[PDB]
Design a protein around this nucleic acid. Sequence first.
RNA 1: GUGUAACCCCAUUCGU
RNA 2: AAAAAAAAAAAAAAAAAAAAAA
Lengths: 49, 53, 102, 114
Amino acid sequence: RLAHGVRLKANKDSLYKPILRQKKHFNSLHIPKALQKALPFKNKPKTQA
Amino acid sequence: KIDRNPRVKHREKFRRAKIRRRGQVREVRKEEQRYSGELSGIRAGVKKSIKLK
Amino acid sequence: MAAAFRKAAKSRQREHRERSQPGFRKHLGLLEKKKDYKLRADDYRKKQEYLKALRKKALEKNPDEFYYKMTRVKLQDGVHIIKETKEEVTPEQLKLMRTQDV
Amino acid sequence: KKRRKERQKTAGDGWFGMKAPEMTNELKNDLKALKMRASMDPKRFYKKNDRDGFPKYFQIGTIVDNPADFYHSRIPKKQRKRTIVEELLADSEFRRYNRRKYSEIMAEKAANAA
RNA sequence: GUGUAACCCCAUUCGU
RNA sequence: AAAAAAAAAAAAAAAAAAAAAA
């Protein structure tokens, strides 16, 4: 490479770079309307309007 | 670099040993300024006397 | 001198580095690794275990069960909503609030 | 029953009959401020609070001037205020520090929220 | 079926 | 722990208030 004019070219993909990840959030659990009716009174989820 | 000289290693261990002691027991200080408060709270619930029986 | 062998080997502390997403697929998002997928995998497992716990409870549900909360509360589409209590103002106080407002 | 009610209105004979003051939004604002005195100054640390709730018997006042302490310990009459809350509003040192911390918490929360 | 409706119905035109 | 409801505040946070799992 020194005798000729060839120069090293490094692939941009292969190099190592900082990732900089961000916190990931998830949906809350959705219970079907049919299941809430089917559930017993003790285990029925009770909320406010 | 601290491990290179044993004397300054022992010097540094003593400085920490005084700091770690400050949690257990209080250091004596003189009234170098007029008393202006405790600089912290005054806890009236702790009873730190030693019972004799 | 087993520990002496270990100390010499760990003299170099350069740790293996992570690879990033290829450029031509950058708009898709971050290349997920085992540490990231494990967050998504444990999230699913918790919800599916909870629904299976709930669906089992519906099996032994007794339709004739009775509780004294049931008398004053009515289901709405199957959901047990606790309706807000009424204030029950009377005309004299209702006239009083308007005089205060003006 | 009625004699119990009369005895609970005062601290008692042991403390020369302190009376429980009526609770107001200005006194309550003062008590909340004192309970959170730990975060006022980053270079000052305090012991834990004695009680979780507010004290039942307490009185409020100001410290009397002493002639010998003209320069050592005395606030000029313009800087004096009526309440502990207004004192916190006045000094630049506390406002500058508190604003910087509160801005940080919102910004870090914004990174978490997005 | 929570992982960051056609079919049918009325009416219009065409035409072995 | 968590899904809610009621207030204030800052450019979301904060105090109380219920249900459900454990």
